[PDB]
Amino acid sequence: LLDPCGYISPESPVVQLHSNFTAVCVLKEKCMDYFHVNANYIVWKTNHFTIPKEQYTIINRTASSVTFTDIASLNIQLTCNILTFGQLEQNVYGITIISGLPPEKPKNLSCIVNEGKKMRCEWDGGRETHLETNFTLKSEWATHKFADCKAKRDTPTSCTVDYSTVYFVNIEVWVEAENALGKVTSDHINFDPVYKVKPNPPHNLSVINSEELSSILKLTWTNPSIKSVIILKYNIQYRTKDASTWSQIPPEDTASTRSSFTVQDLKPFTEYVFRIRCMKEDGKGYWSDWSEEASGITYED
Amino acid sequence: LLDPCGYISPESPVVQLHSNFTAVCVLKEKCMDYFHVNANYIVWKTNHFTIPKEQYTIINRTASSVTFTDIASLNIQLTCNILTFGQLEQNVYGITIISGLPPEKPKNLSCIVNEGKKMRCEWDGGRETHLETNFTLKSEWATHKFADCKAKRDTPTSCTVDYSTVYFVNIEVWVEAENALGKVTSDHINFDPVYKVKPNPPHNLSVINSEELSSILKLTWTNPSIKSVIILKYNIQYRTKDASTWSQIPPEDTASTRSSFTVQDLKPFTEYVFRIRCMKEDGKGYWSDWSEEASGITYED
Amino acid sequence: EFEKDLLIQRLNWMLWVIDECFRDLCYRTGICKGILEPAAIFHLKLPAINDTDHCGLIGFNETSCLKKLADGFFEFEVLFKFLTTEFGKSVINVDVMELLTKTLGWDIQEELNKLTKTHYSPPKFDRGLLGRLQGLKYWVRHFASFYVLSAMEKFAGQAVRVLDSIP
Amino acid sequence: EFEKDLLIQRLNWMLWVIDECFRDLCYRTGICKGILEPAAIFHLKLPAINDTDHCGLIGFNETSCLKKLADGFFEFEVLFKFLTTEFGKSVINVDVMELLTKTLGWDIQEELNKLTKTHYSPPKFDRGLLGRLQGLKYWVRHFASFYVLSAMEKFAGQAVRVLDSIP
């Protein structure tokens, strides 16, 4: 069967940093008969250094054990050997002791649906665990479970689901953190994706002298396709080409879907720069980035 | 069965630029009876513009046809409709006519095995074909075929196989270019991958004053792992810290595997910069890039 | 807790995507609603409100009607899968209509069971149909698109009517 | 056209990788050639040149010997697959040894058929063995690695001897 003289127990442990760990090496009876040895013949080595015999404890004639206390090394290679007659040393078994910490409960879980992309959720991973830790975003409607989204090694605090967003349906979301020392879940959050949209910014912004006055500039633009799902609200900013700060149209005047706006009380024959952004009208969701800036000049008085 | 009044033939053609193309629209008898129409009732449209009736040719009472000559448009949407009584126009069938050119025979096929990477072959794709063209690198030993390597849309002139290089065995390689208008193969090349290696450059370059003279600097370095497969040859370059051009040790003196070299006849208390590269000893394969530069200073006289 | 308003937002979103497919189909194809329709044989049962469903203002009754709305919306998933293949590359969100419609069936199917005692089960996802639908080849697939879209537009439009008229 | 020199370059490359696995195994594991070998029961048939193969200088004969070399090299592919799993992440080119060895079997198997009339067939790739080998768990897998490597080192080393001694 291709088989051994003995083994070390426990098999391939993962322990918590600063804990104690006891390894027991046990020799099979048949092997003991063959080499004419017993526990007293066991020598222990770690990272190629022979562990001094005084730290060994023969528990029975079949077994020897060593105890590491307050483990501070992330990785320990422990080896069990028998000192067979003739000063011949032979390897019995070996294990790698790995240590670290259990994962902290992911917190501040939040999601966002950037227009054109699938839902993405972010969370604060906690304290370093020193262990390979998996993060899995779970999501489900009360009547259907979506594919788990497993975070990438590079980006462990974020996941982007592989399924398209379905607005107007409540979805239950949470993150599962797991490593050899533990599994834990963040609190579950529940929401209608429609309130987590980050629209693209309005584009095709144009400044046109519409009215025959010198204090008016007309802004026109193309709303983002997401207008098919939500009613838009905007923030229109404007300043003179030389001003250092932006002024802003009163939000109330641009509180519902529109593709144009006439800015008034502008100084004559002056150049103005505009930029606009939008988000769901009720303020529930995320402001889009600012559109491309657009320029226009008022007529002379 | 969810079925039609007629069809256009040929189905969804791809034709060569500057050729002629004839489309025939034929009405099923049952449909002709139902609407009380015949070929004379067929109207042809392309890209929403009605083709003038004078360009039509009724081949039989069941069919009408149009002929485009010297096609210069890459894409033509052709539609067949019947002018049913009551000046009611209804759609019979439609096809998209695509045009372009057959692929030119890939030429100058060459391959290279960059140490640490799998074999990569490059070829000159020829004239633009205006059609989606696939490139497939084929490779096989006389007794086993390797996975075809399909070039990426972005990099259509290169492929990197998914199998590891096996030196000392002749491999047959060639490229297959194909698009709707044609399939063609480059000439086949045959070689032992061992003669197409591009080793990594020697690293860990160190300059040490070995001898107790003022005209000597000893160069030491670590050869690339590929030394396990080929005997290395080197090019050692050196110049004074202020020189503008590199001098070079005579290739014959560094014509076989080594990890050190003593440069002589150097000026006293002068600073020297060195750089080295290697390739298969017989000159068959590719020169590695230059190693990191290394500096050293001779003792005072 | 019958959320009609929310179901209506879904129907309008659905109507929006539907409309976008017609426009897209009309643009790339020429096959346009009431200007140039296909000369082809309508040959597949598509959900449609009958008078037997008693869904209009006179002779109305949630019982019979919700039953039809739910059944139809479940029957739409197979159609939306066919549609996703046809418009997925050119129309935003067609790909999630097969889920949205399952959602309308479920929520409506929840009302029925609450309204009656006859326990209802969302119909069988017809793989055979999908297979035949996805089996059409070339031009004729646009015809299927046109008919399917037409049937869905009417139905969904009626569903909004029905839901807005239940107190 | 028996290319012995080329077959020898393959054997030496193979010997090189073999040596690198021993060194790697010795480094991460402590199990080193002649310093600390496993205390375990050798329990699997591994190719090995016998006197019955008549491969030494006295009583030599391509017939009987090439037969063994070819058979062994084909038997090595299953072993190299086990090895690839064990050393693939730490030793360059272990992953192509299963192909290289098939190559030595093929080319050597070509000589036999030319040397005899008994037509030879490269043995059966033993999936059962691979399955048992890849079935070992934890520490003991290093033992298998050690024994397999030892058997391959001896054999391949002998093959080079055999090939250099055929005129």
From Swiss-Prot, chains A, B:
Outcome reported for the amino acid change (mutating G125R): Correlated with increased levels of soluble IL6RB in blood serum
Description of post-translational modifications: Heavily N-glycosylated. Glycosylation is required for protein stability and localization in plasma membrane but not for ligand binding.
Tissue specificity annotation: Found in all the tissues and cell lines examined. Expression not restricted to IL6 responsive cells.
Induction: LIF and OSM activate the type I OSM receptor while only OSM can activate the type II OSM receptor.
Effect in UniProt of substituting C149S: Induces ligand-independent activation
Disulfide bond positions: C5-C31, C25-C80, C111-C121, C149-C159
Placement of sequence motif WSXWS motif: 287-291
Record note on biotechnological use: Two extracellular parts of IL6ST/gp130 linked to the Fc-portions of a human IgG1 antibody (sgp130Fc) inhibit IL6 trans-signaling by the IL6:IL6R complex and has no affinity of IL6 or IL6R alone. Also blocks IL11 cluster signaling through IL11R.
Residues the record marks as carrying a glycan: N20, N60, N108, N134, N204
Fibronectin type-III domain segment(s): 102-193, 201-301
Every Ig-like C2-type domain range: 3-97
Function: Signal-transducing molecule. The receptor systems for IL6, LIF, OSM, CNTF, IL11, CTF1 and BSF3 can utilize IL6ST for initiating signal transmission. Binding of IL6 to IL6R induces IL6ST homodimerization and formation of a high-affinity receptor complex, which activates the intracellular JAK-MAPK and JAK-STAT3 signaling pathways. That causes phosphorylation of IL6ST tyrosine residues which in turn activates STAT3.
Family of this protein: Belongs to the type I cytokine receptor family. Type 2 subfamily.
Subunit structure: Component of a hexamer of two molecules each of IL6, IL6R and IL6ST; associates with the complex IL6:IL6R but does not interact with IL6. Forms heterodimers composed of LIFR and IL6ST (type I OSM receptor) which are activated by LIF and OSM. Also forms heterodimers composed of OSMR and IL6ST (type II receptor) which are activated by OSM but not by LIF. Component of a receptor complex composed of IL6ST/GP130, IL27RA/WSX1 and CNTFR which interacts with the neuroprotective peptide humanin. Interacts with HCK. Interacts with INPP5D/SHIP1. Interacts with SRC and YES. (Microbial infection) The homodimer binds two molecules of herpes virus 8/HHV-8 protein vIL-6.
UniProt free text on domains: The WSXWS motif appears to be necessary for proper protein folding and thereby efficient intracellular transport and cell-surface receptor binding.
Involvement in disease: Hyper-IgE syndrome 4A, autosomal dominant, with recurrent infections: An immunologic disorder characterized by recurrent mainly sino-pulmonary infections associated with increased serum IgE. Some patients have onset of symptoms in early childhood and develop complications, including bronchiectasis or hemoptysis, whereas others have later onset of less severe infections. Immunologic workup usually shows normal leukocyte levels, although some patients may demonstrate alterations in lymphocyte subsets, including T cells.
Protein name, per record: Interleukin-6 receptor subunit beta
